[PDB]
Nucleic acid binder design. Structure first.
Ligand code: MG
Ligand code: ZN
Ligand code: ZN
Ligand code: ZN
Lengths: 123, 64, 115, 14, 49, 46, 261, 82
RNA sequence: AAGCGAAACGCAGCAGACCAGGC
């Protein structure tokens, strides 16, 4: 994860968005953060989607992931506030590549596109 | 009040040299020859053995 | 009352980065490497190894304050080269030199013990 | 600027 | 109030306009800073600290 | 209440209680010293 | 634009000191190696004491601080032990520490010399230098009839930057250019100065001629060990330590180059 | 006093500058409106200082004379030296 | 995507002498 700027409405929402972003990153520090009883095969032994299992596990408990993700210094920038593993915002420290914006972030729009013979969609 | 363990300057052990140093002086040795026999070549360790005062020996004259 | 812990010179505090790279805007192809929890032991060897690279125009190190345990290394190179690349090669070169010095020391020790 | 999130399959953290 | 005193020491690594203040004196003395949307964040974190 | 104090010369752990005169029951000395605590007192060799 | 090809020539090797010479290397590498010998070579030493009883004339901090300065044999154990900061145990486990014990009481009328011999360790590999099978035993404290000293110490792995007790050297005689050819020094009266043991000049001469194309080479060394680590183990552990520091720095560097984008 | 003929110096004194920056900094600290741009300025001192360099401070200095009269000189009418 | 037993609770000072010492 190079950078992430969240603009959640609530602290709980901020935590949920960060967890989703960390899981989507697939960073090794998050895979190693998996702890306790997590199964990637159901009772029928079918193979579940690992991303969904990780997302569910980390949404159930994110304390370990936040603790092991890592911390970095914050470059003072107007409107950007860091966030710490204990969820309390900070101005000097923050999670690695994580920022919180209080002014909002911009929005859905459909764009016409051209598709060639080999199904390669281009703008 | 008791001989230090290491030399403050270099770090050479001197705590095991005090009793031996006194043991040489009573044997009619000169302070310089005694310090040479103990292997103290640098003037920093020689400073440690030649300028020390065993005050603990006087503190033990008082009942505990 | 204020004696700073001794381990504070070498252990990295929680969330503090070991090295930060800042591009110098005064002249082109220059950078500042701010390394935390280090001293003249690495700054001098890296400086000297950088001076030997002819593609390096400037190589110096400084300690902003002796009480602090950080160090700043400035590196300026030619346009065809890069300061990060010079700092990387300089570390690789020092590693090879120490590896070689270690093997030749083990050999010298063996030759001296066997006589 | 309240907005939806399309498909979703997640619960709340603790 | 809001004063201090201790022994001085040389420090060539400081500018002429700088003074090296220990962490103890700096921790006991304080400055009443007014709250604004520009510093509400920093001051908040410092209060919770 | 149970104070196993020490005497200056006689060094006896006489159980001197409160509301009493400090006096060694074995030799009569008037000066008493307390015994080392039982708490775990550690020390970093630095 | 590359490294050098240094050589080594050992002129004296004993159990107390080692005298060697490094050629074809930069002054920075030679000085950093000298600094590592004193400050970045791991060694085992006492760093935790629990005084259970001390009736001696020396207070507790005086005894604890003394005990820390006692050298402990750490030739092959220091590479296996770990630092308490990285160890995933608590208290003082056998993988990150070595337990010591002392129980002495002066029952006789003669003064009892509490020495390092009385320090009983759980590991036979880590023991006081003087206790290793001449040299006398280190003196901790003298006791009078009726006095007692009983404690339970723990040794840890550390280096010189944390405390001088973790310094395995008793002097590092670093020298280069015995004959002042590079003129790094300027003797106002060169005839009044003595000749170094590594000098190669006639007594009629005071210093070698100036060499403009000269560079610092042929660095001389004399690593006198305290006794804990053999004189050669200090040098090997030093070069390995400095190479590890550079390897870790290169790792953090690559992590910062990659983190850029 | 007749504002058409003000005899005081046209430059702002070091004391007038000190008190102007101080009072304006206090105002900004009390969430008062800012007149100039604030690209990366939050500390009220740096804001008041940029406002002085920009000459956009809404303050009038009432210079009292010994006779009892006074001359009201605005921060925009005075020439800043330092 | 997944899925099982299908009430009530952060103190406090003498003061005033005199002596020694600090840059
Ligand atoms: Mg003075
Ligand atoms: Zn010495
Ligand atoms: Zn008695
Ligand atoms: Zn351990």
């Amino acid at each position: 994860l190079i950078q992430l700027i969240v603009s959640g409405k609530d602290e709980q929402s901020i935590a949920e968005a960060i967890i989703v972003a960390m899981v989507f990153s697939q960073e090794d520090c998050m895979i190693k953060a998996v702890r306790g009883d997590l199964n990637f095969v159901n009772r029928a032994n079918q193979r579940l989607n690992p991303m969904h299992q990780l997302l569910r596990h980390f949404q159930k408990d994110a304390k370990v992931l936040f603790q092991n993700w890592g911390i970095e210094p914050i470059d003072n920038v107007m409107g950007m506030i860091g966030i710490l593993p204990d969820m309390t915002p900070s101005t000097e420290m923050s999670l690695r590549g994580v920022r919180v914006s209080k002014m909002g972030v911009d929005s859905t729009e459909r764009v016409v596109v051209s598709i060639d013979r080999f199904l390669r969609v281009r703008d | 009040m008791i001989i230090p363990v290491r030399c403050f300057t270099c770090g050479k052990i001197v705590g095991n040299k005090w009793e031996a140093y006194l043991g040489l002086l009573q044997a009619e040795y000169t302070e310089g020859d005694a310090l040479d026999a103990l292997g103290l070549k640098r003037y920093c360790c020689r400073r440690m053995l030649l300028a020390h005062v065993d005050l603990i020996e006087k503190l033990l004259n008082y009942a505990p | 009352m204020n004696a700073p812990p001794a381990f504070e010179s070498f252990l990295l505090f929680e969330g503090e980065k070991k090295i930060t790279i800042n591009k110098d805007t005064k002249v082109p192809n220059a950078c500042l490497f701010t390394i935390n929890k280090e001293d003249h032991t690495l700054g001098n060897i890296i400086k000297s190894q950088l001076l030997k690279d002819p593609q390096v125009l400037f190589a110096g190190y400084k300690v902003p304050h002796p009480l602090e345990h950080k160090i700043i290394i400035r590196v300026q190179t030619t346009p065809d080269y890069s300061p990060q690349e010079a700092f990387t090669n300089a570390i690789t070169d020092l590693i090879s030199e120490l590896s070689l010095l270690e093997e030749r020391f083990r050999v010298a020790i063996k030759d001296k013990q066997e006589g | 600027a309240a907005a939806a999130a399309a498909f979703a399959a997640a619960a709340a953290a603790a | 109030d809001f004063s201090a005193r201790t022994v001085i020491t040389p420090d060539p690594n400081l500018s002429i306009d700088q003074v090296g203040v220990p962490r103890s004196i700096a921790a006991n003395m304080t400055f009443a800073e007014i709250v604004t949307p520009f510093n509400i964040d920093r001051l908040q974190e410092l209060v919770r600290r | 209440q149970p104070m196993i104090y020490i005497c200056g010369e006689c060094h006896t752990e006489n159980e001197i209680k409160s509301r009493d005169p400090i006096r060694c029951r074995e030799c009569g000395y008037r000066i008493m010293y307390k015994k080392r605590t039982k708490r775990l007192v550690v020390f970093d060799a630095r | 634009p590359y490294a050098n090809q240094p050589t080594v020539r050992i002129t004296e090797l004993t159990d107390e000191n080692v005298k060697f010479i490094i050629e074809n290397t930069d002054l920075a590498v030679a000085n950093s190696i000298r600094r590592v010998f004193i400050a970045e070579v791991p060694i085992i030493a006492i760093d935790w004491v629990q005084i259970d009883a001390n009736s001696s004339v020396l207070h507790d901090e005086f005894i604890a601080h003394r005990l820390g300065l006692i050298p402990l044999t750490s030739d092959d154990i220091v590479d296996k032990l770990q630092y308490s900061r990285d160890c995933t145990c608590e208290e003082f486990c056998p993988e990150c520490s070595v337990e010591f014990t002392l129980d002495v009481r002066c029952n006789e009328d003669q003064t009892r010399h509490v020495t390092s011999r009385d320090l009983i360790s759980n590991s036979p590999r880590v023991i006081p230098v003087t206790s290793r099978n001449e040299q006398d035993d280190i003196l901790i404290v003298k006791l009078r009839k009726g006095q007692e000293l009983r404690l339970r110490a723990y040794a840890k792995k550390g280096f010189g930057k944390e405390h001088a007790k973790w310094n395995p050297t008793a002097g590092v005689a670093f020298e280069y250019d015995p004959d002042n050819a590079l003129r790094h020094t300027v003797y106002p009266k060169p005839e009044e100065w003595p000749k170094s043991e590594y000098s190669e000049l006639d007594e009629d001469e005071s210093q070698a001629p100036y060499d403009p194309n000269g560079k610092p080479e042929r660095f001389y060394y004399n690593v006198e060990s305290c006794g804990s680590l053999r004189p050669e183990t200090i040098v090997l552990s030093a070069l390995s330590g400095l190479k590890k520091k550079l390897s870790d720095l290169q790792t953090q560097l690559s992590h910062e180059i990659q983190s850029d984008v | 006093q007749a504002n058409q003929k003000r005899i005081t110096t046209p430059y702002m004194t070091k004391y007038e500058r000190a008190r102007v920056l101080g009072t304006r900094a206090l105002q900004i600290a009390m969430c008062a409106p800012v007149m100039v741009e604030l690209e990366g300025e939050t500390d009220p001192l740096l804001i008041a200082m940029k406002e002085l360099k920009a000459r956009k401070i809404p303050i009038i200095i009432r210079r009292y004379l010994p006779d009892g009269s006074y001359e009201d000189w605005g921060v925009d009418e005075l020439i800043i030296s330092d």
